Amino acid sequence: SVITVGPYLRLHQCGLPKKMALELFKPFIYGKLELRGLATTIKAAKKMVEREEAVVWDILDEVIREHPVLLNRAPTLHRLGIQAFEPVLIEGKAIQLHPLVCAAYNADFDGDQMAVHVPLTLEAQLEARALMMSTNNILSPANGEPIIVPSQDVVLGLYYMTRDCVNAKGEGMVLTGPKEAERLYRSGLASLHARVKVRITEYEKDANGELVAKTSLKDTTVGRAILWMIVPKGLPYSIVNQALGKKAISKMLNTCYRILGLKPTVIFADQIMYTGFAYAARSGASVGIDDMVIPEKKHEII
Amino acid sequence: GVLKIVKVYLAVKRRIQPGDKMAGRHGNKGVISKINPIEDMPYDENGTPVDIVLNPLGVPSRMNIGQILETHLGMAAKGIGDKINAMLKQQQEVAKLREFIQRAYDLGADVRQKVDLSTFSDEEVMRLAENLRKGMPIATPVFDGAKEAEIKELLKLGDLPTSGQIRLYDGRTGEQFERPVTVGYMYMLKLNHLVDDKMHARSTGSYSLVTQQPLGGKAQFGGQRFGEMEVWALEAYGAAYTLQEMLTVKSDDVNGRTKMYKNIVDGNHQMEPGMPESFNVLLKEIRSLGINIELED
Amino acid sequence: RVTVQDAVEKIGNRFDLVLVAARRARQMQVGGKDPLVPEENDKTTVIALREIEEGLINNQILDVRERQEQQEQEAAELQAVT
């Protein structure tokens, strides 16, 4: 079916419609229905799901739960074009696909289609969870570069968030933590980019596997403290102290993967995507006809 | 050898849903992704919600800057239409309608139109305003179109802001979006690549005759082709049982798939592999030549 | 369940993980053995990997338990006969 976005997803799960889910999982639903004792012969179960009564949707949510599926975009070129997700059921008729994963599939949303495949046997469910799961493919096999790099909206939300301007609301005030930085942004007393001394507590792990806390006052902005609320423990503050374009957020996720491993990098990739979408929505970053500024010197050059 | 032909015409009414394809007239495609409620829409300081929220980031890379000029000129057209609706809903006499429609039809440089309403005789002007109240249509020929200053002067005739950008509030939080955003009217088309014509699913359907594999297509209730590059992409992982059931149990081997169906409806979750029957077809086609292919041991 | 990283930290091959967890899930599903960790109505695959993460199951312990519970069956048969 045709794909669509659904940005509420965690990156190990994808949205899958109820009609496709009841068609692809007919034998598991038959086995579940025969186990409970609701029906007797197989025919009765096929009439039940042909009618789609009120009790087979609980059966369907109990066959989905921990059963991965293989999503596949139709021109598969490398191995990151078949990835295994966990379904989340969708009122609708379109596969909801987590956005970061799109940069692996070369999948935009201009009319694309993807195929779902079901691992039937038990070794195949374990291969989908342990080799082909989308959390397991965060580095491209051609090199060392991360393939779950945040693509387009989220880097605009970050670049508007962690930046600065020479005067805003709350210029040069002092803040006792990142929590009241977000509280000053939400209440309407400061701006998202307004330079400010905060007190942040960065955890540097300089010992042999022991995280040592160092707390200090960084001359930073409001947005850099709000984004510091999402960074895991081990990364230093200077990973967010800059302006965070796309190369900088890619090496942010890369340094998180090299230091803190896989699980903080998966949960931190999701928190990056969520905060990028949220502050890009709050940014209101349009495009106008006045934004393309003609040079005044252009006509004399011609 | 046919007795009678009965033809029946069903008439479906397909509305809209997440998954259809809409697009403007400049290449801005898109799968509609969420059909929001009315309240969540960004509204402005008049009260009206916006209908569709596009994405700005498609403009500087995909260089179709014409859609933003079309958006601003559409907002100018609807501003003139709203002023006609205001001057007509208050039951005003035809003199003020004649004044305003004449000012909205002159408005430019040396142009081709040059209409005058002094030869419409007080009844056509009311019916012309009955047709203009949902907006005023504007022609813009291809390479001799409306420049920027004419769009600005027409946005000044309505009481809209000059830059085309209204500040917009939020529907969820109820608090203002910073840095005022671009609204207007774009003329968007629904394309007939719908989503309840592409969506398909198959547990177990019919099987082909010469090679015991599932049929192809949607009208024939068929399964999706697990092609060659996907086989390469599963060799590229270490997924070995997934590929074995992906090309022996789920696809070809008939005794294997009936054993599989009994094992799935009994909770077992186990495959008895066997051989693809299409490999036996390969043996019969190579063997039907003078070639003697076998299976040793 | 999201990641299987520690299940590879305790079985370093990442392919032997699939064999050990498949053997364990086949013992729990059809053979009717109790899980050694209390579940939360998870499926048998996640309970297998959840036993791998505790460390109380790998291929060594599975061979030990299959040899001892095969010797127990044959010992019960021999003491029933003689």
Partner: peptide
Amino acid sequence: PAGTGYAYHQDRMRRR
């Protein structure tokens, strides 16, 4: 004989 099946092919190549 590469992925998960390399143990199976080790077993089959050992048992000849």
